[PDB]
Every structure is written in structure tokens, then in C-alpha cells.
Curated annotation (Swiss-Prot), chains A, B, C, D:
It holds the Pfam family MR_MLE_C. Belongs to the mandelate racemase/muconate lactonizing enzyme family. GalD subfamily. The keyword Metal-binding applies. GO terms for biological process: amino acid catabolic process. GO terms for molecular function: magnesium ion binding. Keywords: Magnesium, Metal-binding. PANTHER family: D-GALACTONATE DEHYDRATASE-RELATED, STARVATION-SENSING PROTEIN RSPA. The keyword 4Fe-4S does not apply. Has no detectable activity with D-mannonate and with a panel of 70 other acid sugars (in vitro), in spite of the conservation of the residues that are expected to be important for catalytic activity and cofactor binding. May have evolved a divergent function. This is D-galactonate dehydratase family member Ent638_0932.
């Protein structure tokens, strides 16, 4: 085995469908090309600045074989470290180097890690509706596709202040009522169990909409309906309050899509305050740290449910899958279907078949990047008005 | 009082001396201009991308008076949040908004907060030398300047691997030996006490050079010499080990210049694991969060020593001072002297006089920004080779 | 900005309605007058003695700009410190000094702090009745006024011992039966949910009527009815028992109107034993310490519901509002309507409009003091017989 | 036994020597008169306001026999409670009622409690000097009087800012240097042991002069010299830091003269963070609560050293003595000698004989109050400039 020398590092932003996606391409003197995900959809241009202006000049000429040293070196390179942007930039490169290693080995990524610990990972997808009739139709469509796990939301939260009892001269934002959200959610589970029975796995994402006592209360109220998990019941800065949620309820708890600093997960895992970890692999710095995190989780009996939104390249989807097929403590793959155009730009990403995602068969990650087609779909500025989440008195809440 | 409407938000990178500095300028329809610090010296272009491409379009047209709502809104605006880039971008705007409020009030910033807690804040600066003779000359100069607090380092750490017993074919980086660093530091404190006696306040920055047991050992070894503080004895990710340092030594402990996420400081403050907090105000999101942090520290008897390196605009220096004059638990201001050119680009920043920094007298922050002189001193790419810190076997260490 | 020199400090006791109110007036050589609340209704003459005999001679001639130094100095000035009288005296002066700073800045108080966090603060008020019919009429009136949050009490507790099974020769006092109080309160919540449904926010003040196990039991019994909070479930000296309440119930818990020493709140906040803090701002030493407390609460996810009874000047009402508009973690403003005469003596205080209190617009606190009308309504001695609270065997209980 | 009916309650302020002393006289219809201490020397007129305007009208006509009910009733009577003033007012009355009970029983107070648990209590007094020669003379005089326990201070702390390296335009106050205080104290113990040897019991009062790490450091530095106790090493609000002091040093710790709220002592005692409790009996509400506190202390092996300054009536001195002769866990009586005039106003108080204070022999407290002579010595306003304690940068410190 000889040094595999990094020739260039490029970053592309492409919007084939709804989201600005960020891809890193690492090329080598040997002609082996790797691709990675660096998608932070809300701040893509800054991710590109980091790759083009900093990581490129740092990395060219180095030996790609040594992913571990390179990860450790990149991680501390700006002295100050961690955070959504820093971690996403590194992730793109880290994933791309693992892709290269897979190709050089002639093995799918998960086979490098040590191979399968299951025949396929279960998947869930998203169901929603403003009314029960609409929600039911959404659930019915996913059941017809063969999903056994479905994440369900009733109602939509965050519109005009005039839709509730707001103050005079309200500040613009996405306004909602936590009480309405809570009671609608409880009613939703009850109606879902009445219609669909007790075998369907029902997930629900609270999406940090609540104050600590509200989370405690909601957890107790949803317990009779046996959710598969209740996700992001609290924002990361209030995670100590999970101790009280645990004192009051046995609902499975999932948390962590927002994490981008190890200080956020350490005490959570060590005190067994969650059942499933939800980290976005690119937010935590890529495959290298995800493997260590998965093992830390295993030692405390915590299971894996990595974040798999539409705001992620199919490269990222594929990486979740490799991790899910290999790691013994993996539980479930959140999965959002992709457009034809998205598949054309990034060919080769896993698909769900009757609620399961199977082991990938190509060497490395197994997802390409059609640069020419990526040009046809440039970055578009989006306001993301939902992040300006306001309570009924106009208070900003964690969105 | 009437709404003060944001007209524009600009970001400038300027290098009047050694460091790439980043400054945010907020202009208003009313013609009141504010300036803030967003200096993350190792990644300035990315900070600029964030301000120009994201915060500018978000913020134009909003009422500048409501700093608290705007801080809360900006903080969660990209959903993912915290981290060095995101926080520095918001800092720039937050500081500029406080600058505007002081001007509108006709009061120095610290008078807005509720006015003075002290007549002047003590200051320290940096002394170093590769030999004791060199260190002594450097210390003598600062004593002649009237400093009563001096941060001292003996030797320099991070050069060619051929200076150590390194392996064959060593990887490039800044190589050092922890054992050499430790014994030189112990020798240094002994020699400084022999030469200068026991009234001089002597500070020392470990700069995360050590593994946990080494930190414990060094703290015990330095105890007899009564340091004013021992700073960054452990990297953020090993801060739990401060429990062991506390069990073994009464040395004062300072930590936190690296912080950019509240999960890094919460448990350390609550468990009284530090005596001084060292946060870089722009790294934690500006004045707004620094006030709340200062008050959280107060409730636990923790004192303040905000980061004040050369890699910070004089705007940042001034803000440290305002905070230091007001906050009852402020302890000391790290101070690094500035060149004529730096002062010309950012006129009005505080100066140290016989070891003290005095209350500013102008309204707002009291620091301007000479745009034309700034444009004459553009950004320069720097490799920052010291961040590639390697131990005697080649291992990356936290730099 | 120039020194603003304290010319005099005066204290007035006035009873425009039902309660003895205490107000501090700070006059300056510059002619800017500030007013503060020092209302401890049960001991007003002693507050006046403190201000007239001690704080006046201490304070005359000092620079009013430096609120922080003056607060710290006054706080420790008698060596012994804290407690209801000492803190109310200092509050009066502290608030008046903040009033002065707002006027000097030309800004409403909350704008000094950094401006708005919300468009308006929600408000609640008090409903009561000895029968359900009476309670319902009282609740209906507040709902017609636009309140969405109502604090409800069924029955009255504390009368002649002959109404209970009391011992022969009972000692005079306000006698009550905890079992009667508990069962009536449970009955009340059930009846209110049957009548008004599940959107109405219903608050209930236990007012330290119970022993520890009774508090635990009542919290569990009230859980199904989803109270907005249950307040003062335990007296300050038994607050450790909140650990047991938490183990047994998810009801929201409010505490702290009785606090006047930081040792009362520290452990309760740090251990997340409350959801809302209820401190009377003047009882904790004024605006200066209330800001630090609000921020300490914030770090632990505790929300604010400052005490707002009729025994507080409208100056105090206004200060609650300024704090409530600014502080991000403020939740609700307890509001009691004021007579024409009260408004005439203290003009400018906030009014509730359809369940909201809005940002004040005048500089400073925005509340004046009609001295001549104040002198027309002098102090009246009151026995406050309810503070002599006795159980069915004659035992004094915390009232 | 028949009801003993309270006829009047009076309060006198008298200054026979250096301090404003406060005495409460309770007269009865039966003609048995009791006296109590309510001395809060820094705020005497407010104590008198409380007694004359509030406790007098509350208490007349009640049965004095029932001290426990009356204590409990007075304690909660203003709803808000605890604090130096409230507690001192109640103490005066409480002590006076115990005095009456003693007289009615024909027994010295300590005999009511259950009699002696020692033949005499050891005493200490205060030695001081600016220089060692002066300190030694002071110690020599106390040794010649037969003291075996002596509280020693070297140097005086708190004078003009020009005596140290203070900032320009220093704020008036009592300025000192914690470093100077610390090193002088260490030198003092060393020199005391060299001169006097190792049998003399040496006490030292830190008087909350230090920051937490300074306390930890000083505790370690004084350990070799085997102090009898080190008193008030930390202010009450930083008492959690005693955990670190305990981790680092075996010096006996004494704390509590400042206490006037049970929240201040509870966690301290329960976690065995002190060896001696130092409460001022009148600050904690008199004999009734002191007895309960002493028993709480006993269950955790904490010993008693009640505060016995010159700012206490000889009635208070006598009460300390009764408590000290009876309570098994009493350790030592701080004692400051009294002038002829002081003894003439309050005849009958205990004296020290060869380092011991003996059991009192008269019924009740055994100390009278000569009202006519008390007139010859009225209240005098004093500034107490030492409470305005400033550090070298001008910061207020707990005095
Ligand atoms: Cl970042
Ligand atoms: Cl809604
Ligand atoms: Cl486990
Ligand atoms: Cl503390
Ligand atoms: Cl300078
Ligand atoms: Cl929290
Ligand atoms: Cl009103
Ligand atoms: Cl008091
Ligand atoms: Cl001194
Ligand atoms: Cl024990
Ligand atoms: Mg989610
Ligand atoms: Mg440092
Ligand atoms: Mg209440
Ligand atoms: Mg003392």
C-alpha cells in the first residue's frame, strides 16, 4: 500500500429539488475521487467559504490514507472548533476520504468497518396533516408503501399572529400556541390508535416546541399510546430537565439532531437520559467521530437513529445506511424520498423497499456526483421563515 | 423614544498589524452608526460570508432598539446554532447594536448596564523568553510599565521534530515534549519567586498542552509558588477532570477562551471547578450573552477574566473594559499593546496606565472605524502552523 | 456624561386605598427626580426609619450614575444584611436610581436593559368565592375582561375556631382545616374544567397552608386538571421537600414571593425544583439584584412570575412590567386592579388590556408621585389578623 | 400555675461606652419584669420602631408563660420574616419572656433548660496589633489575665487608598489588599508559635476578607500552626466553597455570626462543613430558636461558639453564658470586657475568671436594666466607615 496524495478539494452547492445541498469532492493524484456531505442547508455559502478558502490549501499534498490523523488535525486547525459550519466542512472531507478508502479496498464502506450486524435497517418516513382526515391519508399512503414505522404530526404550527390571541402590533414571525400543539398531539395519538391499532410503530417529533414542565406533561400524556419514540422533547440547553421527564414517564426519548459539540451529548448518554441518539452525521464532523459516538452510545445501551432529512445529500443518506448496516446498536433510518432530479445529480443512493434499507454493494459510499447536472441547479437564497418561531406573546422560542 | 431602523450591515476584514481582524458596521436610517467585533482570526472570510450573505438580508429594516429580541432571533435563525463562526457573526451585530444604544442614550456602554463597580480594572500582559535571562528582561520591562500582574512563559514549544527524540519519517507539524514543558514551567516559577519575591502576581497559560494526570501533577507542583491563576490546564473536552485537579491542589484555575457553546461552561461553573472564566466575548455571541454569563458566574462566586489577545479589534478591547468596569465579579483584563496603525484604524480604545484600565468616557463603545485606512490593510492568508501541534510520537494534541 | 449628585432621599407612607404603601424619592442636584418602591405593607414605619435615619445620611452627595457600586455598598453597609426591611429600604433607592438613569438616557427602563423580548406580557388576576356559584361569577367577570389566565380559590380559610372541631378554650387566631382546604381545592379544579373546558389557564395559590406530605398529595390530586401553576406549595424552610413533589407529579410549581435572602433560592433553582420564580422585586433588594436572579433562572430554564399584589406601589407594578418586557424568560404578570385614588397618587402605571400588559413608553419607570395627594392619605395601623394562622388543634402554621 | 399577663413592652437604646445597645423590657400584670437583647448596633432606631410600633400592640394582654406559641406567632406575624431587624425585635421579647419564666421558677435560666453539662465554659478574648511587638504586648496582657484561648490579628486593614497602589480618583471607603492580609496572617501564626509555643489556643477571624480560592489557600497555609479555629473564612453566600476548603485542609472552621435566616446554616451543618457555629443569638430570633439550632448542631457533631462582641448588651452576654453552661456541645465563649458604666446600666452579667465563665446563680437571666442611668447615655449616630470595604481596584467587598 502506497500514499494516496490529495490533489484538490472542491465544494459545490446544488439545489435539484427543495433544499440547498453541499457536496465536497476530494480528488487524488492516483485518480481516485471521493465525495462527502457538508450540508448545512441554512448557511451553505459559508460552508463553501470554509472548504475553498481554508481546507483546500491546508489539505492538498497530504496522504489521504490516514483519515484519523487528518480528522484530528483538521478538527483543531482553527484552534477554536466544533459548531455547525466548522463540523460540516470537515465532514465533507472526512466522508470523501472514507469513500476513497472504500474504493481502494474494493469494499463497500460498511464492510471496512467490519461488515453487517443485520440484514437490513428498518426505515421510517414522515406523515402529516392539518386535519385527521389529511393525516390519515398521509399515513395510509406510507402503509401502502410497506412502512411499519411512521412519524406523525397533526396540525401545523407557525403562521400569522392574527390566528391566535396575540398582542396589538405583533412582531413578524411564525406564531404558535404550545397548548394547542400539546392537546392536538395527544388527540392525534388517541385517534391513530383507534384507527390503526397497536402494532404500527408511531413516532412523533416535538421539535423543541415546549418549556420543561410542558415536556414532562406531554411525555406522561402520550405514554398510554406507546410511541416508538418522542423526539426533541426539550432543546439542547434544557437537556438536564430530561431527568424529570424520566421520573414521570417511560416513553422512549430521542434527541440530538441539533448537536455539534460533544459537550451536548456526553452527560445525556452517561446518565441514560435518552434511548435513541439523533445526530446529523455531518453536524458532528463526519464518519470518524460518528463511529466513536456510536460506540460510546453502545456502552450505555443507547441506540442509533441518525438524522435523515431532505436537507442532506444522497451521499449523506448512503453514509447513514453504511453506519446503520454495520453498527450493532443502530435502530432505524429516518428516510425522505428523493426526486428524479436529485437521483440524477447523485446516482447510487439507497432506496427503501417495504420499510427496509438494504446493504449497499458498490465500493466506498456508492454515490456519484454529476457536476455538469449540478450546474443546472445552482444555489437559491431562501428565508426559512419557520426559524423565527414566536409564542402567543411574541417571544422567540427555539424553533 | 422612536424606532431606530437598521439601514445596512457590513463586514470588513483588516490587518493593520499581525492579525486578521473582523468588524461589523451597522448603519441606521437615523444616521447612528455602531461597530462590533466579529474577530475569529483563523477563519475571517467565513465570518464575512455569514454577515454579508445571511445576517444582512435578515436584519435590514428591523428596529435596532430591541437588542434582546434580535439577539434571540439571530441566535436560532439557522436552526443549528452556537459555534465559533455563528457566534462571531452575531457578536458583530450585537455589539454594534449596544454601541447604537449608548450613543442614543448619550452614555458610555458600561453606564447603560448600571454604571461602575470599581474605579479601574487591573490589567495583565504577556512576558516570555526562551531562557530565564530573556524572560527576566521581558518581565522587567512590564514591571517598569507599572504592571503588577504578569503572565509568564519560559521556553517555546512547537518546532521541528529533529529537536526531540522523534520517530523516523516524522509528519510535519509543531512538535513538542510535555515533560520538557512541565519541568521548565516549574523551574520558571521557582526562579521568578527567587528573583522578584512574593508580591508580584504571576499568571501562567498551560494552553491545553497536557493530558489529565499531567494537569493534576503540574497543578500540585506549581502550588508552592502561589500563581494568580493557571489557565487552560485541560482542553474543554476533558474539563470533568478538573474535579481531580481540585482534589489535589488549591491553585487558582482559569478556563474558557475556547468556549462557544453553553454546554461547555454550565457544569464547570455549577460545580465550582474554576475560579476565573476566560471567555472571548465574540466567541459566545457578544455583550447580550456575556452579561447573562457574568451573572451566572456571580451566583457561584466565579470571577471574570475575559480573553483579550491581539487577535481582537480594539472595539473588542473596549467592550471587555465596559464589562469589566460594570460587572461586580470582574477580576482582571488581559491586555496586549496595539500598534499606531491599529489605533489609527480603530481610534478611541482604552489604554493601560500603571497596571489599570479606566472607565471609558465617550457614549457607546467609544471606538471608531477608519474605513479608508482599513481598506489600505487587507486580509492576508496565514498558515497558523502552531495549530498543528504534535507530541513526540507524532500525535495531534489540542493546540 | 457628568456626575449626577444625590441631593436628598425621602420616604413616604401612603394609603390611598386598602394597603399601606411605601415610596422612596431620590432628588438630585441636577433636578432629576427618581421614585422607587419599598413596600413591606406589614411593617412600613420601620422601612421609613431605615430610609430616613440611615440611607439618607449615607447616600447624600454620592454619584447616582453608579447604581452597581451603590447597590453593592448599601447591601453590606450595616454588616448584617438581607431580610425584608433591609432589602425594601435598598430597593426604594435602587429603583429610584434606575428611574433617574432612564430619564437621563431618554429611554423607558426596559430599553436600558437592552429592549423588548416580547410584544406584551400575559397577565393574570385573582378570582375567589366561598361557593362555586360565587367563584364562577368572579371567573366570568375576568373572562369578560379578556383574561386567559385566572388564579382561582374556592372557600375562605381562617376564621373562628368554633367553626371547626377545636379544643376547649381555643387561642385567638385565624383557624382553618388543611383537609377541608385540600378537598375543596380538588373539587374546585374539577368543577372549573367541567364548566370552562381545557383552554383556560387556571392558577392556584396554596399559600404555604400544608405540611410536606400534604403538598405531595395535593400536587398529585391536581395533576389531571392541568394547572398553569401551583404556587407556594411549601413554606421556604421546607423547600427541600420539593424533591418529593417532583418525584410524584408533573404540575408546574411556582415559589418565592416570601424570599429575601439568596440562600432561599440558590439550591431550589440549581436543582430545577421550580418552574416559575415568584419573588417580590422590593423584597430581594430592587432591580439590580432582580436582573442577576432573572439571568440565574434563565441558565436553568426557570421562568419569571414576579409577585404583583395590591400591597405594592404602582411604581412596583411598572418595574415588574419593564422587567417582564425585557427578560426573555419572563412568563406572566400577576395583576391586581387599582382604584382611581391609587392612580391619582402614582400616575402613569401600566394597565392590562385583554390579558396583556404592553411596553411602557415614557423615559425611566414612567410613574410619578403626587406628594400632596399622598399626604392626604396617611398610614393607618392594621392588625393583619390572617397572619395568626392556626390549625384545628391551635398550632401556628406558616400563614 | 396561672397566666402571666403582658402589661407593656418597651425598647431602649443606650450607649454607655462605644456601641449603641438595644434592650427590650417586658412588664407583666403580676409585676415580674423581664429584659432581653435586641442589639443590631448598626440599625438600632429601626429595631426600636419594630418593638414600639408593632410588637407592643401585638403582644399586650397575652400569656407570657407560653414562650413557644408566642415565638412561633411573632416569627410569622408580618408574613415576610427572618432578617437582622425582624429577628432582633423578636429576640428582645423572647429573651425577656425566658427571663420571666426563670424568675417565676426561682431558677437560673440554664437550670430551666435542664441544668449544667460542664463546671464552667472556657472563654477567649481579642488580641491585636499593627506590628508584632504591639500584638505580643496584647497577647501578653490576656495571658496575664489567665486566658488560654486568644484570638489574634496582625495588622489593620481598611484605610486610605493612597496607602496602596490604587487607581486615580479613588472612591472613598476602607481600602485594603487581600494579599497583604494573607501573608501577614501566615507570618503572625509562625511568629506566635515561635514566641509562645504550642499549648496556647490561637484563634483567627478572617472576617470574610477573601475570595473562595484565597480562603482555600489560606486554610492550607495556616494548617501547620494548629489554630483553634479559623473564623468566617468565606462570606455566607459563598459557603458552598467550604467543600473545597475541607478537601485541602484540616483547620477547624467557624462560621455564622452573620446568619439571620435558617437557609444560611442548614446545608452547612448537614454536610459537616463547619466545626463551630458562630451565630449571634439575637440575630437568629433569641433563646427559643438558639436551643433548636444547638440541638441540630449536636446531631451532626458541630460545636457552639456563639458571637459575643462588644455590640451586645450584658443581657446578651448572660444569655450566651446560660446556653454555654447547659448545652453539651458548647465549646467556648467569646468575651469582651465591659466598662464600669456598662456594668452600672446592666448589673449582674458574668465575668471571666482565669479563662472561665461560671454558672450564673440568680433566677432568670440575672441582669438588670437601670433605666434612669440608661437616660444619661442616649443613642449616638455613628458612620461605621469600616463597612465600606474596598479592594485595591476599588471594588466593594463583604466587610
Ligand atoms: Cl460554526
Ligand atoms: Cl398554534
Ligand atoms: Cl448500560
Ligand atoms: Cl457560591
Ligand atoms: Cl495600547
Ligand atoms: Cl436547564
Ligand atoms: Cl389598573
Ligand atoms: Cl430585616
Ligand atoms: Cl492592606
Ligand atoms: Cl455526626
Ligand atoms: Mg427532528
Ligand atoms: Mg490563553
Ligand atoms: Mg402568592
Ligand atoms: Mg467574627
Amino acid at each position: 500500500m502506497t500514499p494516496v496524495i490529495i490533489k484538490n478539494i472542491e465544494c459545490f452547492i446544488t439545489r435539484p429539488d427543495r433544499h440547498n445541498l453541499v457536496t465536497v469532492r476530494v480528488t487524488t493524484e492516483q485518480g481516485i475521487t471521493g465525495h462527502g456531505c457538508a450540508t448545512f442547508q441554512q448557511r451553505p455559502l459559508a460552508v463553501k467559504t470554509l472548504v475553498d478558502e481554508y481546507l483546500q490549501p491546508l489539505m492538498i499534498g497530504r496522504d489521504a490514507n490516514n483519515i484519523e490523523d487528518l480528522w484530528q488535525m483538521m478538527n483543531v486547525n482553527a484552534y477554536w472548533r466544533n459548531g455547525p459550519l466548522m463540523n460540516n466542512a470537515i465532514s465533507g472531507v472526512d466522508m470523501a476520504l472514507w469513500d476513497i478508502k472504500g474504493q481502494l479496498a474494493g469494499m463497500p464502506l460498511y464492510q471496512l468497518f467490519g461488515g453487517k450486524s443485520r440484514d437490513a435497517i428498518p426505515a421510517y418516513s414522515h406523515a402529516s396533516g392539518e386535519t385527521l382526515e389529511a393525516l390519515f391519508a398521509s399515513v395510509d399512503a406510507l402503509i401502502a408503501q410497506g412502512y411499519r414505522h411512521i412519524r406523525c404530526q397533526l396540525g401545523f404550527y407557525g403562521g400569522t399572529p392574527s390566528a391566535l390571541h396575540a398582542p396589538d402590533n405583533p412582531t413578524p414571525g411564525a406564531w404558535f400556541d404550545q397548548q394547542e400543539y400539546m392537546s392536538n398531539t395527544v388527540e392525534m395519538f388517541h385517534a391513530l390508535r383507534e384507527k390503526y391499532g397497536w402494532k404500527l410503530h408511531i413516532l412523533h417529533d416535538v421539535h423543541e416546541r415546549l418549556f420543561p414542565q410542558q415536556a414532562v406533561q406531554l411525555a406522561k400524556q402520550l405514554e398510554p399510546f406507546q410511541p416508538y419514540f418522542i423526539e426533541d422533547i426539550l432543546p439542547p440547553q434544557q437537556s438536564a430537565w430530561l431527568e424529570q421527564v424520566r421520573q414521570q414517564s417511560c416513553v422512549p426519548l430521542a434527541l440530538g439532531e441539533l448537536f455539534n459539540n460533544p459537550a451536548e451529548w456526553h452527560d445525556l448518554i452517561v446518565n441514560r437520559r435518552i434511548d435513541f441518539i439523533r445526530c446529523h452525521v455531518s453536524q458532528i464532523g463526519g464518519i470518524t467521530p460518528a463511529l466513536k459516538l456510536a460506540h460510546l452510545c453502545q456502552a450505555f445501551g443507547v441506540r442509533l437513529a441518525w438524522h435523515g432529512p431532505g436537507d442532506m445529500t444522497p451521499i449523506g443518506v448512503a453514509v447513514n445506511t453504511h453506519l446503520n448496516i454495520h453498527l450493532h446498536n443502530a435502530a432505524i433510518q429516518e428516510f425522505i424520498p428523493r426526486s428524479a432530479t436529485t437521483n440524477d445529480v447523485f446516482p447510487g443512493a439507497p432506496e427503501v423497499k417495504e420499510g427496509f434499507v438494504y446493504p449497499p454493494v458498490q465500493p466506498g459510499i456508492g454515490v456519484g456526483f454529476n457536476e455538469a447536472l449540478a450546474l443546472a441547479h445552482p444555489v437559491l437564497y431562501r428565508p426559512h421563515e419557520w426559524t423565527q418561531s414566536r409564542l402567543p406573546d411574541g417571544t422567540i422560542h427555539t424553533p
